[PDB]
Amino acid sequence: RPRTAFSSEQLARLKREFNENRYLTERRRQQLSSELGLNEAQIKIWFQNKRAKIKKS
Amino acid sequence: RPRTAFSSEQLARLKREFNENRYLTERRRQQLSSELGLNEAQIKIWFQNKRAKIKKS
DNA sequence: TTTTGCCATGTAATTACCTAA
DNA sequence: ATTAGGTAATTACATGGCAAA
């Protein structure tokens, strides 16, 4: 498998972004893409996965 | 998956099951497929659809 | 000390089912 | 029928620190 590695500066805006808003919109899902230069699908699962550990944690 | 059509022999067995419980279970999806000769995934979607309809009331 | 030799974690990805159009 | 994005459960794997000769 190709396990993506996140940049210390990506994990940051993601996190910052989850705080303010834990549910991604398409617009928002899009913009993040541009900016972080990540694909709308990984930002997708990230948020899913965040919410997940928060629940189990 | 090709649009299909249920026999009345099947359609009425689906409706009798959907009467006992609206949620299918894996083993039971199985059981009905070998029974009614349908394809699991067809059974699965009938149910979804039915639930969604019944809801509307 | 050092070097080797394992594990246990965290997490990213993935699956199977959900309601709703 | 299909489709997207949600939850819950996983599985794969890249890692750090620990144990021991």
UniProtKB/Swiss-Prot annotation, chains A, B:
Consequence of changing K53Q: Reduced specificity and affinity for DNA
Entry similarity comment: Belongs to the engrailed homeobox family.
Organism superkingdom: Eukaryota
Stated name of the protein: Segmentation polarity homeobox protein engrailed
Function: This protein specifies the body segmentation pattern. It is required for the development of the central nervous system. Transcriptional regulator that represses activated promoters. Wg signaling operates by inactivating the SGG repression of EN autoactivation.
Residues of the full protein shown: 456 to 512 of 552
Localization per Swiss-Prot or TrEMBL: Nucleus
UniProt DNA-binding region: 1-57
Post-translational events: Phosphorylated. Phosphorylation may directly or allosterically modify its function.
